[PDB]
Amino acid sequence: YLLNKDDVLTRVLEVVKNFEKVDASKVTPQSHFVNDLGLNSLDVVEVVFAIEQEFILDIPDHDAEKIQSITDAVEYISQNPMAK
């Protein structure tokens, strides 16, 4: 039903580490996409859509514009019942 936050964090960390713009050592479990990682908002859309690629769940437009940090991405998938 509800996946544990530890396994949800391992997946989202692997995505942002293997991303084309985010560096490996520059990422930290408590980081922001724009400030701590230095990404643009158009790149925030790509890393969010990348998370939606591995998590089969579909995020609406309003709930997607709220995820601006890795902490928000983990908490959303945790409360989402469609976390495969």
Partner 1 sequence: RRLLKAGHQQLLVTDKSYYARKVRHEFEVTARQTSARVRGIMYERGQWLVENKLGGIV
d(Cα 16, Cα 80) in Å, to the nearest integer?
A: 20
41 binds, among ligand PM8, partner 1, none (CB under 5 to 8 A by kind): ligand PM8
Is 63 a residue that touches partner 1 (CB under 8 A)? no
56 interface partner picked from ligand PM8, partner 1, none, CB below 5 to 8 A per type: none
Per-residue buried b or exposed e for 44-80, using 16+ beta carbons within 10 Å of the residue's own CB: beebbebbeeebeeebeeeebeebebbeebbebbeeb
In the region spanning residues 18 to 57, those forming contacts with ligand PM8, defined by CB under 6 A, are 40-42
Nearest approach in angstroms of CB 25 to partner 1 is: 26
